[PDB]
Structure formats: structure tokens, C-alpha cells
Design a protein around this motif. Sequence first.
Motif, short mmCIF file in Angstrom:
data_model
loop_
_atom_site.label_atom_id
_atom_site.label_comp_id
_atom_site.label_asym_id
_atom_site.label_seq_id
_atom_site.Cartn_x
_atom_site.Cartn_y
_atom_site.Cartn_z
N UNK A 1 8.73 -33.96 -0.54
CA UNK A 1 9.32 -32.57 -0.38
C UNK A 1 9.12 -31.81 -1.59
N UNK A 2 9.21 -30.48 -1.37
CA UNK A 2 9.29 -29.50 -2.43
C UNK A 2 10.63 -29.05 -2.62
N UNK A 3 11.27 -28.97 -3.61
CA UNK A 3 12.67 -28.16 -3.60
C UNK A 3 12.30 -27.12 -4.67
N UNK A 4 13.21 -26.20 -4.46
CA UNK A 4 13.18 -24.96 -5.34
C UNK A 4 14.68 -24.39 -5.15
N UNK A 5 15.25 -23.76 -5.94
CA UNK A 5 16.44 -23.01 -5.83
C UNK A 5 17.31 -23.93 -5.09
N UNK A 6 17.59 -25.04 -5.68
CA UNK A 6 18.75 -25.76 -5.13
C UNK A 6 18.61 -26.49 -3.83
N UNK A 7 17.25 -26.38 -3.05
CA UNK A 7 17.18 -26.65 -1.73
C UNK A 7 15.93 -26.95 -1.34
N UNK A 8 15.70 -27.83 -0.56
CA UNK A 8 14.21 -28.45 -0.04
C UNK A 8 13.78 -27.05 0.86
N UNK A 9 12.33 -26.92 0.28
CA UNK A 9 11.57 -25.76 0.84
C UNK A 9 10.85 -26.05 2.04
N UNK A 10 9.98 -27.26 1.46
CA UNK A 10 8.77 -27.74 2.72
C UNK A 10 8.55 -29.04 2.44
N UNK A 11 8.07 -29.78 3.41
CA UNK A 11 7.79 -31.12 3.34
C UNK A 11 6.39 -31.71 3.89
N UNK A 12 5.87 -32.63 3.24
CA UNK A 12 4.75 -33.30 4.07
C UNK A 12 5.05 -34.58 4.33
N UNK A 13 4.65 -35.22 5.71
CA UNK A 13 5.08 -36.49 5.89
C UNK A 13 3.59 -37.30 5.83
N UNK A 14 3.72 -38.17 4.85
CA UNK A 14 2.54 -38.97 4.80
C UNK A 14 2.19 -39.67 6.38
N UNK A 15 1.66 -40.90 6.14
CA UNK A 15 1.25 -41.72 7.54
C UNK A 15 -0.40 -41.99 7.80
N UNK A 16 -0.90 -41.51 6.84
CA UNK A 16 -2.63 -41.48 6.74
C UNK A 16 -3.08 -41.77 5.49
N UNK A 17 -4.31 -41.59 5.10
CA UNK A 17 -5.11 -41.68 3.84
C UNK A 17 -4.29 -40.93 2.78
N UNK A 18 -4.22 -41.53 1.78
CA UNK A 18 -3.55 -41.02 0.53
C UNK A 18 -4.09 -39.53 0.21
N UNK A 19 -5.53 -39.57 -0.26
CA UNK A 19 -6.10 -38.43 -0.55
C UNK A 19 -5.90 -37.22 0.11
N UNK A 20 -5.58 -37.60 1.60
CA UNK A 20 -5.50 -36.40 2.40
C UNK A 20 -4.00 -35.90 2.50
N UNK A 21 -3.26 -36.89 2.23
CA UNK A 21 -1.69 -36.63 2.07
C UNK A 21 -1.57 -35.51 0.71
N UNK A 22 -2.48 -36.12 -0.31
CA UNK A 22 -2.48 -35.22 -1.52
C UNK A 22 -2.98 -33.79 -1.21
N UNK A 23 -4.06 -33.71 -0.45
CA UNK A 23 -4.36 -32.34 -0.10
C UNK A 23 -3.39 -31.32 0.44
N UNK A 24 -2.72 -31.93 1.34
CA UNK A 24 -1.72 -31.43 2.14
C UNK A 24 -0.39 -31.08 1.04
N UNK A 25 -0.37 -31.93 0.16
CA UNK A 25 0.88 -31.61 -0.70
C UNK A 25 0.37 -30.40 -1.51
N UNK A 26 -0.85 -30.53 -2.05
CA UNK A 26 -1.49 -29.31 -2.81
C UNK A 26 -1.39 -27.96 -2.12
N UNK A 27 -1.37 -27.95 -1.03
CA UNK A 27 -1.36 -26.68 -0.17
C UNK A 27 0.14 -26.40 -0.22
N UNK A 28 1.09 -27.06 -0.18
CA UNK A 28 2.63 -26.86 0.00
C UNK A 28 3.05 -26.37 -1.43
N UNK A 29 2.33 -26.95 -2.49
CA UNK A 29 2.68 -26.52 -3.83
C UNK A 29 2.18 -25.26 -4.10
#
Length: 118
Positions: A86-114
Motif C-alpha cells: 500500500x501507498x499511504x499519504x496524508x495519513x491514509x491509504x491512497x492505493x494498493x497492489x496485491x501480489x500473487x504472481x511473479x515478484x518482478x511483475x508485482x514490482x512494476x505494478x508498485x512502481x506505477x502506483x508510486x
Amino acid sequence: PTSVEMEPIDDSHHLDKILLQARELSQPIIIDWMASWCRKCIYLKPKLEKLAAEYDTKIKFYCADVNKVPQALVKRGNISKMPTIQLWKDGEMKAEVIGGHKAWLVIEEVREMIQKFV
Ligand SMILES: [Cl-]
Ligand SMILES: [K+]
């Protein structure tokens, strides 16, 4: 830095202090809600620590083991699956990524969220 260790969150009061610090710096934070029996979580850790180094001084990364931390802290995240990054900002959760699959692919989805909130 090539890798930065994620800091564990102790409890809800620690989360509160973390969020006050992030607000002082006008930065988001990342929380990795994970379980130690979950192979996806375990395999993601080193890739998240490499990503945290790419954002050293810009975004602090934290982790919370859902079986070890108090139940009240897990409820702060509204967690239902692991790993939940989860990405939090201003005291609350703003977005999240659920893993479940290949770690590198989760990381690219987290990068898009950031990139949306940084
Ligand atoms: Cl707590
Ligand atoms: K949820």
C-alpha cells in the motif's frame, strides 16, 4: 544504496508516528503487509528492498507481518490478501497492489502506483 531494508511497523501507535513523520516531509510511504509462510511475500522482499533503494530519501518503505503485529494494526490496512503493498499519504491509504504472481511483475505494478502519488 543498492538495497534499503524495510522497517517493521510495531503497532497502530507506531503507524501513527510514521504517518506524522511522512506528513512533515510531504512524502508518501509504502507498507508491505506480508506473512512469513507466504512464498510470494518471501520472494518479493529482496525486490522491494531494491525498489526502496531507488526511492531512498523520497519514500520510506515499511513492512508488517500480519501474524505477528497486533490485530488492530492489520485492521488499519483493511488487509484481506498477502502481499498487499500500500501507498499511504496524508495519513491514509491512497492505493494498493496485491501480489500473487511473479515478484518482478508485482514490482512494476508498485512502481506505477508510486509514480501516480509521488
Ligand atoms: Cl495496535
Ligand atoms: K482488503
